[PDB]
Design an enzyme around this catalytic site. Structure first.
Site, PDB file in Angstrom:
ATOM      1  CE1 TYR A  95       8.016 -18.896  18.295  1.00  0.00           C
ATOM      2  CE2 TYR A  95      10.163 -19.676  17.560  1.00  0.00           C
ATOM      3  CZ  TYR A  95       9.395 -18.771  18.263  1.00  0.00           C
ATOM      4  OH  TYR A  95       9.997 -17.729  18.941  1.00  0.00           O
TER       5      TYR A  95
ATOM      6  CB  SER B  21       5.807 -28.106  15.820  1.00  0.00           C
ATOM      7  OG  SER B  21       6.891 -27.719  16.663  1.00  0.00           O
ATOM      8  CG  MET B  22       5.151 -23.980  19.207  1.00  0.00           C
ATOM      9  SD  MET B  22       5.391 -22.221  19.343  1.00  0.00           S
ATOM     10  CE  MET B  22       6.874 -22.076  20.338  1.00  0.00           C
TER      11      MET B  22
ATOM     12  CD1 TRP C 178       8.553 -28.090  21.761  1.00  0.00           C
ATOM     13  CD2 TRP C 178       7.076 -26.492  22.320  1.00  0.00           C
ATOM     14  NE1 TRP C 178       9.197 -27.188  22.569  1.00  0.00           N
ATOM     15  CE2 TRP C 178       8.317 -26.204  22.935  1.00  0.00           C
ATOM     16  CE3 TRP C 178       5.996 -25.627  22.536  1.00  0.00           C
ATOM     17  CZ2 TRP C 178       8.512 -25.080  23.724  1.00  0.00           C
ATOM     18  CZ3 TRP C 178       6.190 -24.511  23.329  1.00  0.00           C
ATOM     19  CH2 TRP C 178       7.439 -24.254  23.922  1.00  0.00           C
TER      20      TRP C 178
ATOM     21  CG  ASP D 299      10.803 -34.382  17.638  1.00  0.00           C
ATOM     22  OD1 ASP D 299      11.572 -33.419  17.825  1.00  0.00           O
ATOM     23  OD2 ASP D 299       9.601 -34.217  17.299  1.00  0.00           O
TER      24      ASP D 299
ATOM     25  CG  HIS E 195      10.102 -31.159  15.374  1.00  0.00           C
ATOM     26  ND1 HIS E 195       9.273 -31.615  16.375  1.00  0.00           N
ATOM     27  CD2 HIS E 195       9.710 -29.890  15.105  1.00  0.00           C
ATOM     28  CE1 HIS E 195       8.415 -30.661  16.698  1.00  0.00           C
ATOM     29  NE2 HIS E 195       8.658 -29.604  15.947  1.00  0.00           N
TER      30      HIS E 195
END
Length: 259
Positions: free
Chosen positions: A60, A130-131, A155, A175, A207
């Protein structure tokens, strides 16, 4: 004789620097493609060989530069890699998965001739941060012929992904953005028991560790891609009987340690 084997016999140290293949880069402008926001291709040069392909999604707000080190790292070990920019920086994981699919189609079909000349269009894999790690899991469900996925500090709001595509999930122990107890570990546990899977937990990491050069991420990402994209069993040694100072945890169903 494995026709997909590339490069000399590995050592762990060799997987912590760029690999032996020279790399060229091509910038894919946003306005030149559809279905994704363009990105950067890293691909081998000075070679007559062909290589598997990898599409990588940033997370993101991020763009392709946040994974540039990793795209180049993988390409230099013998892969054609596209790191995408997304249509919007605010796209969520499932949108990113669609854009990874568009980017893989583009890579196979409409990328520059010099890129396609280096690509075995049938041996493809995915990774992301992540995303973009959530997107890696989602696209692995949607395209079960993908050879591997590497979700990096992933994520996603959905926790169960029904895919046969081997996954190596990198968690960051400390994280607080995508806590491993709520994201990475559930993702690992909820993949089908029959799917080869590994969970690598970076000791004391946070993260955004994947956005900077990281020796452990390099070792495990290269090794999983080599093992599954190239069927290169010389890389099993880094994924089996693991005792790595960089890790606070390592879990696997150990399906990848044998034929």
């Amino acid at each position: 004789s494995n026709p997909y084997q590339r490069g000399p016999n590995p050592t762990r140290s060799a997987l912590t620097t760029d690999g032996p293949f020279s790399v060229a880069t091509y910038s894919v402008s946003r306005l030149s493609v559809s279905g994704f926001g363009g990105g950067v291709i890293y691909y081998p040069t000075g070679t007559t060989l062909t290589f598997g392909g990898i599409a990588m999604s940033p997370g993101y707000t991020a763009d392709a530069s946040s994974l540039a080190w990793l795209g180049r790292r993988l390409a230099s070990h013998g892969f054609v890699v596209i790191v995408i920019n997304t249509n919007s920086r605010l796209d969520f994981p499932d949108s990113r998965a669609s854009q990874l699919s568009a980017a893989l189609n583009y890579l196979r079909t409409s990328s520059p001739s010099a890129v396609r000349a280096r690509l075995d269009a049938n041996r493809l894999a995915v990774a992301g941060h992540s995303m973009g790690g959530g997107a890696t899991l989602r696209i692995s469900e949607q395209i079960p012929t993908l050879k591997a996925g590497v979700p990096l500090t992933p994520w996603h709001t959905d926790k169960t992904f029904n895919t046969p595509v081997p996954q190596l999930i990198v968690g960051a122990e400390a994280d607080t953005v995508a806590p491993v107890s709520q994201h990475a570990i559930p993702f690992y546990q909820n993949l089908p028991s029959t799917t080869p899977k590994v969970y690598v937990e970076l000791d004391n990491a946070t993260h955004f560790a994947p956005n900077s050069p990281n020796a452990a991420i390099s070792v495990y990402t290269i090794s999983w891609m080599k093992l599954w994209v190239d069927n290169d069993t010389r890389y099993r040694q880094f994924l089996c009987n693991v005792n790595d100072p960089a890790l606070s945890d390592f879990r696997s169903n150990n399906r990848h340690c044998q034929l």
